Amino acid sequence: AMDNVTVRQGESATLRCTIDNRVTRVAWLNRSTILYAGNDKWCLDPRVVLLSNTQTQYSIEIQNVDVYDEGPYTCSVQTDNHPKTSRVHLIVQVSPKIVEISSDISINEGNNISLTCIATGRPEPTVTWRHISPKAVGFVSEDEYLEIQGITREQSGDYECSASNDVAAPVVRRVKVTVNYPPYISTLQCEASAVPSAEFQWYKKVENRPFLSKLIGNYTCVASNKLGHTNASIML
């Protein structure tokens, strides 16, 4: 005749037991074991402290509760006509915690990559992957295990893992992915995009910005990185 009780890990749980009329003796039990009988402290664990022994209600408190303390707890009352008992289930909760994620990586285009996010908590959290890359389309997925086949430069960016249960606010940790792709070329200027940023070469001074180079007959622009090389020519 009493509502379930639920507390977070490392908190205090109060187990109350309302009484009426007159009762000879009252007790609290942890499964079969006895915790308190009247004002007699059976179990010697200091976390269990008696709170109220007035006839109106009999209540104890469990401090610094762990998940192992979850289970049924009965308030064994004894009355002359019939003996009554009231069972109460203690439910412990653990905030979600991301135990493992893949470390930050840089990868060549067109390879197989994989991302994982192992999270713990009580109850089991719901893990989701989000593509956090700005200035690009994103996506959310309900797969803990995330695989990418034939990775493209369009898929570079951060990947945020989120593990959530109703116990606490979801916890997030992200991983930045940078995708390596050979350069593609786009007074005299030569625009190109590459990861890592490509060093330009001009062939028959010159200021080299990170995203483009400029030069102040027919000449060719050569853009190159560790993966490959491209040449583009322009005539003035």
Ligand X SMILES: *[C@@H]1O[C@H](CO)[C@@H](O[C@@H]2O[C@H](CO)[C@@H](O)[C@H](O)[C@H]2NC(C)=O)[C@H](O)[C@H]1NC(C)=O
Ligand Y SMILES: *[C@@H]1O[C@H](CO)[C@@H](O)[C@H](O)[C@H]1NC(C)=O
Where along the sequence are the contacts to ligand X (CB under 6 A)? 30-31, 33, 43, 45, 47, 62, 68-69
d(CA 145, CA 219): 50
CB count in 10 Å sphere of residue 157: 19
What is the smallest separation between the CB atom of 41 and a copy of itself, expressed in angstroms?
9
- Site track for ligand Y across 81-120, x = CB under 6 A: --x-----x---------------------xx--------
d(CA 42, CA 27): 10
Whose structure tokens read 């009352």?
77
How far, rounded to the nearest angstrom, does the alpha carbon of residue 169 sit from its chain's CA centroid? 9
**CA-to-CA separations, 186 to 122, 191, 202, in angstroms, rounded:** 53, 5, 15
Q: Using CB under 6 A, pick the residue from 4, 39, 54, 187 that binds ligand Y.
A: 4
Widest CA span in the chain: 114
Does residue 71 bind ligand Y (CB under 6 A)? yes
- CA torsion through residues 165, 167, 169, 173, sign: negative
40 binds, among ligand X, a copy of itself, ligand Y, none (CB under 5 to 8 A by kind): a copy of itself
Q: Which is nearer to ligand Y, 69 or 160 (by Cβ)?
A: 69
Take residue 15 and report the two structure tokens written for it: 């187990």
Span interacting with ligand Y, options 66-74, 116-124, 157-165, 185-193, rule CB under 6 A: 66-74
What is the smallest separation between the CB atom of 3 and ligand Y, expressed in angstroms?
6
Residue 136 CB contacts under 8 Å (≥ 6 apart), including other chains? 154, 157
- Site track for ligand Y across 12-51, x = CB under 6 A: ------------------xx-------------x------
- Binders of a copy of itself among residues 18 to 37 (CB under 8 A) are 24-25, 27, 29, 31-34, 37
112 binds, among ligand X, a copy of itself, ligand Y, none (CB under 5 to 8 A by kind): ligand Y
H or E element that contains 95: strand 85-101
What is the smallest separation between the CB atom of 131 and ligand Y, expressed in angstroms?
19
H or E element that contains 182: strand 171-185
3-state secondary structure of 230: strand
Residues in touch with a copy of itself (CB under 8 A): 24-25, 27, 29, 31-34, 37, 40, 42-44, 74, 76, 78, 80, 83, 85, 87
